[PDB]
């Protein structure tokens, strides 16, 4: 479960 976001 991701707790942050990074570029696709």
């Amino acid at each position: 479960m991701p707790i942050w976001k990074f570029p696709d």
Partner: antibody, heavy 118, light 113 residues
Framework: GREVQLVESGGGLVQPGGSLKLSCAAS????????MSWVRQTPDRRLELVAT????????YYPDSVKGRFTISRDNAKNTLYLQMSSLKSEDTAMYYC?????????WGAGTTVTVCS | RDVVMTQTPLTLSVSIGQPASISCKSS???????????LNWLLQRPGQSPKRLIY???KLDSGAPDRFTGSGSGTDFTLKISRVEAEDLGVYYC?????????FGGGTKLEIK
């Protein structure tokens, strides 16, 4: 708790229009599992993300204030993150932090100071 | 268009033991297509690197004390300190990760009266 650590290096003096490479060594966790980001803090104490990269290195982002001048990259076998800065201006004089917000354990480095000369 | 994070108050002077409340309002909804809201709270103690206290609006960082509570939704977010102690003084920042660029709030300085 477990010991995760990030250590920035390569900060120092640089002339306007010059170039500088920063490195961030990661230890204590599987580096290749996480995206990484460079966050800088200007003398006015404001925080700004200048570069971010996903875990495999194929996806990067830069804000417009910096886009085209900085290049983020990573070497997962070497457990190292890089920030290549070029065409530097006085606005880039700041403390440069290395961080991985995807980690459940708080992971920031102590930072490395960059000073753009007159 | 970049998301602007308007954080208030700029300075908050408190006595030790008193409660505190910090607000962060986004110019754009921070709800992601995957159903999560990426909103972090950080505290930079003097002479220290920033330290995460909350992620995903309300989840308390395992290295942060149980005196911080994160809440909010959409564009309005709030950080509350149940009782301000010496450890809690410093500059707080809200950080949104839903949209690129992932921008910070302007900071909130929590100091002693």
């Amino acid at each position: 708790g477990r010991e995760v650590q990030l250590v920035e290096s390569g900060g120092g003096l640089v002339q306007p229009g010059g170039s500088l490479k920063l490195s961030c060594a990661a230890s204590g966790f599987t580096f290749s599992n996480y995206g990484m980001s460079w966050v800088r803090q200007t003398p006015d104490r404001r925080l700004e993300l200048v570069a971010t990269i996903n875990n495999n290195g194929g996806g990067t982002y830069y804000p417009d204030s910096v886009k085209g001048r900085f290049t983020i990259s990573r070497d997962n076998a070497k457990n190292t993150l890089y920030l290549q800065m070029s065409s530097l201006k006085s606005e880039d004089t700041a403390m440069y932090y290395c961080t991985s917000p995807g980690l459940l354990w708080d992971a920031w480095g102590a930072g490395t100071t960059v000073t753009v000369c007159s | 268009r970049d998301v602007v994070m308007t954080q208030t108050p700029l300075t908050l002077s408190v006595s030790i033991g008193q409660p505190a409340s910090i607000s962060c309002k986004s110019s754009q909804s921070l709800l992601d297509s995957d159903g999560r809201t990426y909103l972090n709270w950080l505290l930079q103690r003097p002479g220290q690197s920033p330290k995460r206290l909350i992620y995903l609006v309300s989840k308390l960082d395992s290295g942060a004390p149980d005196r911080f509570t994160g809440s909010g939704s959409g564009t309005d977010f709030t950080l509350k300190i149940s009782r301000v102690e010496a450890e809690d003084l410093g500059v707080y920042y809200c950080w949104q990760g839903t949209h690129f660029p992932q921008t910070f709030g302007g900071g909130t300085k929590l100091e002693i009266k």
